[PDB]
């Protein structure tokens, strides 16, 4: 856990697990992700926490899409953290999910502008 995820506070485990399992079966070429801003990161907050993303989507393209979504400058820093490790920009969401998904069948990603976060 790269963060204290608000999503986990607001949804009980078995509801999460049942949903993540169902979604993995229904959409085998996508992976269910929870994306939350690090709490003290002074950057834009996303409106939604819960996403279903292409398994072949790279981290680098996700960064680009987030920049476009929240108007985070091309020149400013943006990092993902999965279990406190920053994935390479070439990593895919499917690769990260396979290695790091939780027991509720979701992958949890924190984002921040701070390289040394956590």
């Amino acid at each position: 856990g790269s963060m204290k995820f608000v999503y986990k506070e607001e949804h009980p485990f078995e509801k999460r697990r049942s949903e993540g399992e169902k979604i993995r079966k229904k959409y085998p070429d996508r992976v269910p992700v929870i994306v939350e801003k690090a709490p003290k990161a002074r950057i834009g907050d996303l409106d939604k926490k819960k996403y279903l993303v292409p398994s072949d989507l790279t981290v680098g393209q996700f960064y680009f899409l987030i920049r476009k979504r929240i108007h985070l400058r091309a020149e400013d820093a943006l990092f993902f953290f999965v279990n406190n490790v920053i994935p390479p920009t070439s990593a895919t969401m499917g690769q990260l999910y396979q290695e790091h998904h939780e027991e509720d069948f979701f992958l949890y990603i924190a984002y921040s502008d701070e390289s040394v976060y956590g």
């Binding site: 979604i23 959409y27 939604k48 819960k50 996403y51 279903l52 993303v53 292409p54 072949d56 989507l57 790279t58 393209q61 899409l65 476009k68 979504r69 895919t92």
Partner: peptide
Amino acid sequence: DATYTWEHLAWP
């Protein structure tokens, strides 16, 4: 990777 948009990330 193929080109994706924000809408490709939507919870269904």
